[PDB]
A paper describes a structure:
The structure was determined by the selenomethionine single wavelength anomalous dispersion (SAD) method and was refined to a resolution of 2.6 Å with good crystallographic R-factors and stereochemistry. In agreement with our biochemical results showing that CaM binds SidJ in a Ca2+-independent manner, only the first EF-hand of CaM is observed to coordinate with a Ca2+ ion on the difference Fourier electron density map. The SidJ core, thus named kinase-like domain, assumes a classical bilobed protein kinase fold. Surprisingly, a pyrophosphate (PPi) molecule and two Ca2+ ions are bound within the kinase catalytic cleft. In the SidJ kinase catalytic cleft, two Ca2+ ions are coordinated by residues N534, D542, and D545, while the PPi molecule is stabilized by R352 from the Gly-rich loop and the conserved K367, which in turn is stabilized by E381 from the αC helix. In the migrated nucleotide-binding pocket, the aromatic adenine base of AMP is stacked with the imidazole ring of H492, while Y506 forms the interior wall of the pocket. The C-lobe of CaM assumes a semi-open conformation, which creates a groove between CaM helices F and G and helices E and H to grip the amphipathic IQ-helix of SidJ.
Through structural, biochemical, and mass spectrometric studies, we identified the biochemical function of SidJ as a protein polyglutamylase that specifically adds glutamates to a catalytic glutamate residue E860 of another Legionella effector SdeA, and thus inhibits the PR-ubiquitination process mediated by SdeA. Here, we report the crystal structure of SidJ in complex with human calmodulin 2 (CaM) and reveal that SidJ adopts a protein kinase-like fold. Moreover, we found that this glutamylation activity by SidJ is CaM dependent and that the glutamylation of SdeA suppresses its PR-ubiquitination activity.
Numbering used by the authors:
A (entry chain C): 1 to 55, 61 to 127, 134 to 145
B (entry chain A): 98 to 495, 501 to 850
Write the structure that this text describes.
Amino acid sequence: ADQLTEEQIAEFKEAFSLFDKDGDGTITTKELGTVMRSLGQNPTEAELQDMINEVGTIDFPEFLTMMARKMKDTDSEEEIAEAFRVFDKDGNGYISAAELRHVMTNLGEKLTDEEVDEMIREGQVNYEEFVQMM
Amino acid sequence: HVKQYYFARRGETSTHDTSLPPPVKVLSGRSIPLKEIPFEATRNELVQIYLTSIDKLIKSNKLNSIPSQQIASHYLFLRSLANSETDGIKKNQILSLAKPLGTYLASKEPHVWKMINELIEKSEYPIIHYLKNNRAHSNFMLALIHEYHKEPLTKNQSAFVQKFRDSSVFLFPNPIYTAWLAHSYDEDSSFNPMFRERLSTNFYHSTLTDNLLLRTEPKEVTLSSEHHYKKEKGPIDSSFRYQMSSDRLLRIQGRTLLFSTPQNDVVAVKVQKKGEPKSTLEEEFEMADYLLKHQRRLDVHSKLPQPLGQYSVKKSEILEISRGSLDFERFKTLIDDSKDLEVYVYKAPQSYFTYLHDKNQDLEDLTASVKTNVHDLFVLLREGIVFPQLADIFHTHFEDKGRYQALVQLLNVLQFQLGRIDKWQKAVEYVNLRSSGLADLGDSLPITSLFTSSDFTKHYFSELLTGGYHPTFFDKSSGTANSLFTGKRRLFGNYLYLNTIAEYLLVIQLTLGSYGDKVTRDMMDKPKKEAVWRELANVMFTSCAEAIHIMTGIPQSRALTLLKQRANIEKHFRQTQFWMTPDYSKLDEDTLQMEQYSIYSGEPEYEFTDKLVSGVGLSVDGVHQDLGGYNRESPLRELEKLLYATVTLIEGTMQLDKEFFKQLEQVEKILSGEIKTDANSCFEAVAQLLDLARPGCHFQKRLVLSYYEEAKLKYPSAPTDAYDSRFQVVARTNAAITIQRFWREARK
Ligand SMILES: Nc1ncnc2c1ncn2[C@@H]1O[C@H](COP(=O)(O)O)[C@@H](O)[C@H]1O
Ligand SMILES: [Ca+2]
Ligand SMILES: [Ca+2]
Ligand SMILES: [Ca+2]
């Protein structure tokens, strides 16, 4: 079901634990939409309603496979393009390379120096092209 | 699948104060009633007095005469309190008072006013970011009450101030305290609950935990109908009898006879002790079986023993089998005196009969084993199962031999540090933590027995269940002994819970220490010894982080980082290595003082008037080493700090998550329309959610950002100047994380 990264599983684990209000290692459907929203995957009415029908409680392995199914729907192409966009104050599609070091390495799951150097390869470098590469 | 989940659900209740000893103390056969000084009512009376005193500060035009860092503390505290206040009239009283301080700082100390406004655009409770260093030690709130409030404090108020004079933090209302405490462990925090006053040094880690716990609600755990301690079972079936051959008897361990099998595992016949009832053996059978059945459900890592029977055997037969082996006489004395003895028969790997401190394990296998033991202890704790006799740890004041209390300061009146451990290495000699994982599973308690007046709590913790007496507590007017302590009757279960968490990790520490002493005693190589003790420190820190992970869900890497903010691993390794080996017993006074300076690095050296035993060290009995002198504290200061750090992160976080969801529920009600309100106080409720998120946790912040957007759609007609920078910072991070996950996949 799940080809997820170490980091995704760390995140979904803490999130599951937090919204497991009684510590029995299962969440109710009450919480499911709110927890889903917390992980960037706010569901439609129907998708949330479909998940609710499938059922009371949901353990953590069942969660790691609901999440993968919703993740398949996501266009990588768009979800990555809308992220880079934040760093584009203007509509130029241009960001700075001296900078993008000081972003990737100072925020989130921070990149290592080797990873930052490896990225700068692929004065300035534009984002709209970079997504087309992958 | 096999469903993963616990047979226990945790909730809340009105009080733990049901069926408890009367709150009374008997002195010269006179009955003295013990009264509780309410924590919340008294805290609040003092914040009112603080606000009056600010009022009086303003009216004296003496702002000029208090230092700047204090005026900041006052201003920032009053902004944070105003933000926590839902009454508009009081909210407004509080900002009237802030405003003259703000007028002043702007005009006369403006590098400082600029530092303030930075914190104000990050937070609704900016005081907690201000007090992340040495500033927390300056009690600006008590200092000012002392200057401007010209009445004696009440008895209650005075008692409160006596207990929490260390920091103004202790006066903060619940959501501001909880949020300070959690963020105090963060990567940009340098706070340490330690301060040098005069030449003396004041350690106040325990007080962070008491201030926190006195704010909490009484917990309650409900075990399913299916729980081990609930489901009604029938008698045990024992349709098979193991035929004992002296030919297959490997050796005698304690009262258990060990026999080999064709499969290279072991059949154990555990024989009944003098005065041991049949039921003790029965419960070990029943608990081995339950854990074997639910093993997959619980992700139990231990290699569990497999139960085979519980039945009566002739002593003539037990004697006829054992006769040859070494230990025959000790076993003969150990076992009951009766013609018919009950046995419990089970099968187990060889690794089960290996004690977790065994010097034949190398560090890799020991680490693997410790991790298994630690995992199962906390996973089983979540399931509702407690093991109260993993080891035989005792204290002694002079002679009273008492069960060791890992958080002794929380559970009694006016005890300041962990007491000396008697014959420490012996206490774990026969620890029920094995190379395979857990053992001696029948010696176990339902977690509910910690939240009520069980035979156990009434026995080991009756000061905590009765109330606090001490002569300084006695009022002559009301005829009663008043204390903060007597208030713990309502929350006593929450205290025993945390105690249990520290106690598990204390046993792990003693087991690690025994292994280290045994492995390094004959080492010739002084850097190689030091290596072992550095690694045992890493295992101890890591275990504490595993416990955080399992109880809270904080990733272990973040938990290890939070711990190291508070507990120093260089010092822990140095202290353990010094006091858990006999080498200090050979040092002269000057060398001993020089060595002590290194292991405590500027903190006060351990003081003792005891005479050291050559080749042993501190030892009351002339033969076994102790941790501490006669009537003195344990010298493992850092261990104490680490056990308190661990237990404060777990409770700290549960209680932070509670504050969050109470705010969330308020934001969802506003957003949906179930509470009509103005724009600006919708934004305010959302910004507040930001503050209550766990430190280092992104996914909460993300949810709040989502709430924020939702709100701007609802009230588009309203500026966002006060809130834009913080939300943009959350947004940049959310965007950067997606870019990072994208790049990680590309490398593959
Ligand atoms: N049951 C206990 N478990 C752990 N430490 C204790 C216990 N009782 C007292 N202590 C501590 O041991 C030291 C000496 O004992 P006492 O003279 O009873 O205070 C003090 O520093 C106490 O805080
Ligand atoms: Ca649940
Ligand atoms: Ca045992
Ligand atoms: Ca036992």
